Amino acid sequence: AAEAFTKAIEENKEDAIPYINFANLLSSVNELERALAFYDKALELDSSAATAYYGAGNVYVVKEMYKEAKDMFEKALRAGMENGDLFYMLGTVLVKLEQPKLALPYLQRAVELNENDTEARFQFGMCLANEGMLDEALSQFAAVTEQDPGHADAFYNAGVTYAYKENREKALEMLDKAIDIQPDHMLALHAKKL
């Protein structure tokens, strides 16, 4: 809820960690701006504190300031943080910002580091297909289908991939299964009428 973290800061004015912990608490309690002020303080004390860059980044994500979230996440990564979640948040934010050519290596990594993360794998798929690497996109879309068979979006994006492969067979096949799952998939609907 609150206390502890507050006093831990007192007489420890010099340590970044307690400021980070308090900022983490403030995030979870909807005090986003104040969280940012505490992450700021931590970074003023230790400009290498990866978790402060990461914590601030998530705040930026919630507020949908993606350019600033990219900045924070890449600083986290630069300061040392390397894990599935970070590569994911960075990958995905790089997507929202156009520039897939940049999301690709980090999204690739998130899958590697967690082959079970359906969400990451679907985002990697879309980025691969976007970049021209279309067969490896289908590789990924298929694996998403194996873990989550209720994943209509994957089927649709598979459907769209096959279109760029010049094939009005498997395209309509995969597209069917998307409407099959979600009867109100308007994009799958409009895609099929072509």
Swiss-Prot record:
Pinpoint the residue ranges of every TPR repeat in the record.
1-15, 16-49, 51-83, 85-117, 119-151, 152-185
Tell me the keywords, alphabetical order: Repeat, TPR repeat
Q: Which Gene3D superfamilies match?
A: Tetratricopeptide repeat domain (1.25.40.10)
Which Pfam family, just one, is annotated for this protein?
ANAPC3
Task: Give a short account of what the protein does.
Answer: Could be an interacting mediator in the complex formation among RNA sulfuration components, RNA processing components, and aminoacyl-tRNA synthetases.
Which PANTHER family does the record match to this protein?
A: TETRATRICOPEPTIDE REPEAT PROTEIN 6, UDP-N-ACETYLGLUCOSAMINE--PEPTIDE N-ACETYLGLUCOSAMINYLTRANSFERASE SPINDLY-RELATED
Q: How does it assemble?
A: Monomer.
Name of the protein in its database record: TPR repeat-containing protein YrrB
Naturally occurring in which organism (per UniProt): Bacillus subtilis (strain 168)
Give the taxonomic lineage as stored in the record.
Bacteria, Bacillati, Bacillota, Bacilli, Bacillales
* Gene encoding the protein: yrrB
